[PDB]
């Protein structure tokens, strides 16, 4: 079996990959290691390759990796990153060490897009695409909770995909999350509010070092939440919110002043007000007053790009159910993951 693989060094690590993947180059990095570009000689297109080193070394790693495999396999939507291939170089359960995930290749993450010149056309489209992908996830009960610019990728044609499937420091986490409260689908709409806002102002809306500093920077801006929210926190946490200085915050006029948008064409102040509006529907601390995914898609700023084939797609059929709520021994995870890698390879 070993005749099918070759190895190349990528910085520190060794990528042992099927011979169909040629010319690996590093395209980015993160927790789960380095990610490469490659040329797939079979499909005759460029692809992306992610190496998972011992996805089964401990419960957290295994649970996360297994879920991602299964979900990436069964989900098929243009705004969610698609699985092209998955393989392992080791030739038996015992030797089994590593998992390689082969994806569609994109050009950059959202961090770069923010440090970059934009307009309403492209901004509205990027936001429209994010919403589509989210809606799709929600339609299968996947609620992300952890959307950030680094896990969202774009292509030069301005197309966008979400790199991962969220939870089963954090600037973009919704207030209802930093405060250990209940959440619904629109918890992800907070994240999208932060990202939008961040594109506009060029910099992070709420840069806290921990959970404490994070929350304060939110009330400082939008103001202390209503009495109807501060007593929605469990006794312990409802103690903090009614224990720190109370601010009035700013209007979304002061947070996102006219000067931040192009105000030439009559229709460019139109878009400017439309954009400001959506932000205020999204960055609502109280997750009950907050706009929903279906609502945003309808909002005038966004809906110009509406297409039912992409905004209203059939939900994924996730065939594992117990998925993201099962517990196994490390040895059982190794089996599950290996099994799933073997079954999913083309």
């Amino acid at each position: 079996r070993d005749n099918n693989f070759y190895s190349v060094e990528i910085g520190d690590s060794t990528f042992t990959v099927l011979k169909r993947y040629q010319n690996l180059k590093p395209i980015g990095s993160g927790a789960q290691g380095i990610v490469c570009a490659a040329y797939d000689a079979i499909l005759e297109r460029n692809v992306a390759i992610k190496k998972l080193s011992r996805p089964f070394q401990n419960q957290t790693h295994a649970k996360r990796a297994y879920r991602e495999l299964v979900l990436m396999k069964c989900v098929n939507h243009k705004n969610i990153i698609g699985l092209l291939n998955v393989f392992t170089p080791q030739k038996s359960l015992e030797e089994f060490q590593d998992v390689y995930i082969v994806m569609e290749l994109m050009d950059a993450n959202l961090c770069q897009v923010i440090q970059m010149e934009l307009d309403h056309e492209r901004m509205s489209y990027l936001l429209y695409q994010m919403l589509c992908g989210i809606k799709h996830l929600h339609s299968a009960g996947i609620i992300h909770r952890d959307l950030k610019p680094s896990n969202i990728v774009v292509k030069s044609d301005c197309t966008l995909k979400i790199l991962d499937f969220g939870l089963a420091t954090r600037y973009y986490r919704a207030p209802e999350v930093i405060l250990g409260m209940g959440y619904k689908e629109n918890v992800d709409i907070w994240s999208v509010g932060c990202i939008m806002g961040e594109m506009i102002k060029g910099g992070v809306l709420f840069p806290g070092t921990d959970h404490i500093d994070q929350w304060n920077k939110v009330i400082e801006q939008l103001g202390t939440p209503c009495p109807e929210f501060m007593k929605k926190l469990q006794p312990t946490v409802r103690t903090y919110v009614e224990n720190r200085p109370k601010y009035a915050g700013y209007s979304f006029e002061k947070l996102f002043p006219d000067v931040l948008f192009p105000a030439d064409s009559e229709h460019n102040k139109l878009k400017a007000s439309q954009a400001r509006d959506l932000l205020s529907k999204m960055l609502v601390i109280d997750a009950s007053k907050r706009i929903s995914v279906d609502e945003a898609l309808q909002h005038p700023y966004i809906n110009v790009w509406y297409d039912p084939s992409e905004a209203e797609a059939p939900p994924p059929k996730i065939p594992d159910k117990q998925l993201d709520e099962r517990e196994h021994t490390i040895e059982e995870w190794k089996e599950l993951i290996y099994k799933e890698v073997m079954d999913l390879e083309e």
């Binding site: 050009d107 292509k155 030069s156």
Partner: peptide, 12 residues
């Protein structure tokens, strides 16, 4: 529906 063909991000 407006065209998405010309939309470009200088990333290449």
């Amino acid at each position: 529906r407006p065209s998405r063909d010309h939309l470009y991000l200088p990333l290449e």
